[PDB]
Structure 1
């Protein structure tokens, strides 16, 4: 999840309806369960992301057919297919999980 600005659980998990609704209730209840952990910290977290440590600390992201610009948080990165942003690890973590960024 998914990740900035989560901001809702949607379009994820290609299994969707094919997987049993009994599990999906558990699932939605579970991400609802983790929203509270998100709400205790005050880290900030971003717990969902950054399993792999920052270096260093600016990277280069090459657009991958994404539109864009949807980068509202922090700044309007103005997403544009065939455009690489010499941007800090910060918004890279959040945006790479979605599927916009490609090369770290």
Structure 2
């Protein structure tokens, strides 16, 4: 959204300020769009998802999700797209 020992210090600085640039771009007039969003077209409105790794009751923008390991949700893809991206959820 926006190991490191491999990179040289110049590359580390480059990556840091490039992430800063990406966030600055995301903050502009394209705010309504999630520029660092998903590039696969939206197909289904509701999907079954499974919790892949246990975590607390994460409070996302769209709502509160009680991420119990080995529990399924029937939710809208748009809401849980970030959690799938990070790896807390799986589509199945």
**Could you tell me the TM-score, scaled by structure 2's length?**
0.86
Instruction: Count matched residues.
Output: 92
Q: Say whether residues 1:70 and 2:70 are aligned partners.
A: no
Once residues 68 and 98 of structure 1 are traced to their aligned partners in structure 2, the CA distance between those partners, rounded to angstroms, is 15
Give CA-to-partner distance per residue, 1:56-92, whole Å, 9 cap, x none: 1111111112312213322111111111111101122
Q: RMSD across aligned C-alpha pairs, in angstroms?
A: 1.7
Detail structure 1 runs of 4+ shifted over 6 Å in the superposition. Answer: none
Structure 1: gaps spanning 5 or more residues? 3-14
**More relative contact order, 1 or 2 (CA 8 Å, 6+ apart):** 1
Partner secondary structure for residue 59 of structure 2 = coil
Segments of structure 2 that go 5 or more residues without pairing to the other structure are none
Greater strand fraction, Structure 1 or Structure 2: 2
Structure 1 or 2: more helix by fraction: 2
CA distance in 1, matches of 2:37, 2:20: 17
